[PDB]
Design a protein around this nucleic acid. Structure first.
Lengths: 33, 100, 101, 52, 143, 141, 116
RNA sequence: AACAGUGGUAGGAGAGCGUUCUAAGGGCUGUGAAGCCAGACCGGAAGGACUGGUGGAGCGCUUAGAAGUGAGAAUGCCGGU
RNA sequence: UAUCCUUGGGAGUCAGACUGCGAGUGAUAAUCCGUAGUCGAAAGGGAAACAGCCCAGACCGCCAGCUAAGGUCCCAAAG
RNA sequence: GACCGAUAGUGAACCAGUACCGUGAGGGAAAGGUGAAAAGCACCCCGGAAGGGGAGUGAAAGAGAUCCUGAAACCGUGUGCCUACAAGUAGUCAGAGCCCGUUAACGGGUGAUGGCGUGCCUUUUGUAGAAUGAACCGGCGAGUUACGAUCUCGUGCAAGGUU
């Protein structure tokens, strides 16, 4: 229980919008112009 | 004083003077000896026929590491362009003795 | 060394810096006599401070009140009061540090 | 105005604003410092005769 | 929210907006509850496995009947000294032995468990388990 | 790592006679000496040139029909009051100006472009009063 | 939870207002105009690591061209005969650092007319 | 290990660093903790660490799940100048 | 020589700009059938300066080596 | 309480639906912190007093009544190096001179002078624009929640799975 490492390929960071210019989809949050 | 052109632009090296050469392997702590002496000078042994024959320069490999951290930034005039990168450049310090 | 802070005596701290430009390198007796010869509105306030600056030194460090000279003469802005467009009433910290020569 | 002024064009406009030392002499009576050509506030005498 | 704020409807658009400091937050967490469930097959095939970690490293310790007489917590400290268990532990007893439950609740490391109320958590935290043998026959019957 | 000089520059003094040379032909070789192009040590921010003295400026000549054609303009700060002159009057009334104007164009512009112009000395006739420096004659290479 | 985040903004704005240490005027105090002259001063410093690679060339050529006028040869006439007779691949830098020593340069200048 | 390749907005895919929190452990702090100001160090970036001053009660670290988000732009809103 | 089919997930754009070549036309003058290129999304060198012309495509260093267009009196590197 | 900790949480942590605004229905703020303790400065000195300087209290007066910590804009006073023939999105490479000594490192700070160099964001076929926006600093401020569809991934069982 000290190092409960989850299975690989079971979780994925949620995509964000408007939290970076180099991260992608920040200016218009990937919704077009 | 010899002009040695080993791995890069030729450098002027007199007797008893340290220089900075690019990262050859060189096993820092040991000695090394270049082999491409051009124009050993003094008594003017020209560089006729691609590097004077028999002329070598013995050197002692002394210190390997990096340079000052040049941090290259780069961006365009528009379109949200941004790029950033650091770069430590490796180097090798060698002292100089006994021009052959 | 002698110190005299006047804290929040009511004068605008740019009309008081125009009087502390001749008493930051002069002799101590030769500055107090020049303060009463000036027509400056905020001249008496400084006079009182200076007079108290000498009397701090010659009583508590006992340092020969005709040998002193003025080292630091600054004026700092203090807390303001605002009235009614809005009118501010500025204030001033006046300090004077006197030392021997 | 069209654009504000910096701290360099502000502090250069205050060289010709400072005030000067008035003319101070040494009273012949018993004073230390007093404006020239005038009557002292502390002795209160002119030339060589106290008129007060 | 923007609507449940005791705010104005007239233009000062509105005095309680998302950008206004007087207004509330745009999104914000609301009264919700997250309660999912595994299948029944995946709810009884794990309690064995955390038990199975304990048969490896001898973290199971089995006792007979959990002999007690009264509620003296001085006895349990001698029992933990006797079984040489040091940190947090477990006690599983099948019949709700009242002298056991009234004791040891004040001793900080340990806890007692009525044998049906085992679950996948306390086996992981308490990391060792004083079991009566009388409870071992029960736990195969439910799983 | 290469040699770059530092305020230790021994200026020579060179005499150049303009006996029958042309305006732009003789000024094109003088403004490399002024800038210091001919010295083996030369750094573009230290002004390692050397002084030149020009003798018999009124003996110069310019080819073609330029002695009536080339008109010198010196428009002042006054709008609509731009003066103008020719090149026959310039090499006769004051021929000093014609050489030091055409030198001035070939020199760079800026601080060193007007520092280097202080090394130029163009006198009339054929005599310089600078004999305390002992200049020597340098012909046009 | 709620995250205020005050300790993470100033440490992200000191490291810009430290790289502006030495600019004129307001451009080393105000963050709004110190960020522009850091994003431009990394842009010139990339553009001008290519000119100093190519404007030390116009230094070494202009010094060699003056050191060749001692022997009548221009620069183009000299380099043309410096690759024919002589097999040396001497840099235009290291054929310029020896300008101080006339004797040295002269020796190499004698071979230029040997195959010209 | 040799080759091949690396401008880039819309947009698509992938790998990361940080900010608060409640616990399984493990561990510094009144011989001075957070926060603050300095610095001429470390990492490919986001960012880390060590000395020194100031502060007078707490913080933090590989390990897992959640995050009222990490701001330079709204003829933004409140304060200060 | 290594690309293109299928199926499925995810979209963006829907007034582009100018310089050329094959038929006309229009005033055989500035639309338009075709097609190419660049910019848009592309910096660097040349045309004095120049979004569309000329050459060319930036991983990052180095005070390494030869060329492209274009150039060689001086500004400004080279006859 | 995987809730907030004074721009949050109720409008309101404090003599708040108050003060203010409006004839009226109605609208509607701002504002927490000495110290373990009040031990909250006897007395001396300048001054009309405020406010000081000593002295005392205290572990700390840099803790003295808007009093913990106390950032930034803004305003200052000293001091090393430059600056009164010079046309500059203020920087960037080259570079003496001069002053310094570091988390020891191809050091640090200034920089006479030469080269190159049409701010930032949004939007447009397209920017240097006079096309739009910002006085500056600080704070707050904008894509995921159970309910339904569909696909990928992970996992359990699997012609049976699941409450």
């Amino acid at each position: 229980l000290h190092e409960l490492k989850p299975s690989e390929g079971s979780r994925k960071t949620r995509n964000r919008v408007g939290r970076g210019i180099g991260s992608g989809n920040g200016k218009t949050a990937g919704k077009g112009h | 004083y010899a002009i040695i052109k080993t791995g890069g632009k030729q450098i002027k090296v007199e007797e008893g003077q340290t220089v900075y050469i690019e990262k050859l392997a060189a096993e820092a702590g040991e000695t090394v000896t270049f082999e491409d002496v051009l124009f050993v000078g003094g008594d003017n042994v020209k560089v006729g026929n691609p590097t004077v024959e028999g002329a070598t320069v013995t050197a002692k490999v002394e210190k390997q590491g990096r340079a000052k951290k040049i941090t290259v930034f780069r961006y365009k005039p528009k379109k949200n362009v941004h790029k950033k990168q650091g770069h430590r450049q490796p180097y090798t310090k060698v002292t100089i003795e006994k021009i052959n | 060394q002698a110190k005299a802070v006047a804290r929040t005596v009511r004068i605008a701290p740019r009309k008081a810096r125009l009087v502390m430009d001749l008493i930051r390198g002069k002799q101590v007796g030769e500055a107090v006599s020049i303060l009463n010869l000036t027509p400056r509105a905020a001249s008496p306030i400084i006079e009182k401070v200076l007079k108290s600056a000498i009397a701090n030194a010659e009583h508590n460090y006992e340092m020969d009140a005709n040998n002193l000279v003025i080292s630091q003469a600054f004026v700092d802005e203090g807390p303001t009061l605002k009235r009614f467009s809005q009118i501010n009433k500025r204030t001033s910290h006046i300090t004077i540090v006197v030392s021997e020569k | 105005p069209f654009r504000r002024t910096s701290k360099m064009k502000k502090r250069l406009r205050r060289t010709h604003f400072k005030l000067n030392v008035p003319g101070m002499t040494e009273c012949p009576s018993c004073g230390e410092m007093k404006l020239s050509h005038r009557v002292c506030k502390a002795c209160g005498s002119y030339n060589g005769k106290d008129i007060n | 929210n923007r609507s449940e704020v005791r705010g104005g409807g007239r233009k000062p658009g509105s005095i309680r907006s998302p950008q206004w400091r007087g207004g509330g937050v745009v999104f914000g967490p609301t009264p919700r509850s997250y309660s999912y469930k595994l299948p029944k097959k995946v709810r009884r095939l794990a309690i064995k496995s955390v038990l199975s970690s304990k048969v490896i490293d001898n973290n199971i310790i089995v006792l007979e009947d959990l002999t007690l007489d009264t509620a003296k917590t001085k006895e349990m400290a001698a029992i933990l000294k006797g079984l040489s268990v040091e940190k947090k532990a477990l006690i599983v007893t099948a019949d709700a032995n009242e002298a056991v439950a009234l004791s040891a609740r004040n001793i900080p490391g340990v806890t007692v468990v009525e044998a049906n109320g085992i679950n996948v958590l306390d086996v992981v935290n308490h990391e060792k388990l004083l079991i009566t043998k009388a409870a071992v026959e029960k736990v195969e019957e439910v799983l | 790592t290469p040699m770059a000089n530092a305020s230790t520059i021994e200026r020579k003094w060179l005499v150049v006679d303009a006996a029958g040379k042309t305006l732009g032909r003789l000024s094109s070789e003088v403004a490399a000496i002024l800038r210091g192009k001919h010295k083996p040590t030369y750094t573009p921010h230290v002004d390692t040139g050397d002084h030149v003295i020009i003798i018999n400026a009124e003996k110069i000549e310019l080819t073609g029909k330029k002695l009536t054609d080339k008109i010198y303009y010196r428009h002042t700060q006054h709008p609509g009051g731009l003066k103008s002159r020719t090149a026959l009057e310039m090499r006769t009334n004051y021929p000093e100006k014609m050489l030091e104007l055409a030198i001035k164009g070939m020199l760079p512009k800026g601080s060193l472009g007007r520092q280097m112009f202080k090394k130029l000395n163009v006198y009339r006739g054929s005599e310089h009063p600078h004999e305390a420096q002992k200049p020597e004659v340098y012909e046009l290479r | 939870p709620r995250v205020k985040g005050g300790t993470v903004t100033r440490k992200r704005r000191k490291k810009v207002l430290k790289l502006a240490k030495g600019y004129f005027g307001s451009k080393h105090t105000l963050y709004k105009v110190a960020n522009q002259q850091v994003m431009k001063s990394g842009n010139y410093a990339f553009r001008d690591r290519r000119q100093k690679k190519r404007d030390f060339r116009k230094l070494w050529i202009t010094r060699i061209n003056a050191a060749a006028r001692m022997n009548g040869l221009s620069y183009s006439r000299l380099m043309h005969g410096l690759k024919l007779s002589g097999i040396e691949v001497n840099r235009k830098m290291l054929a310029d650092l020896a300008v101080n020593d006339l004797t040295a340069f002269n020796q190499l200048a004698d071979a230029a007319k040997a195959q010209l």
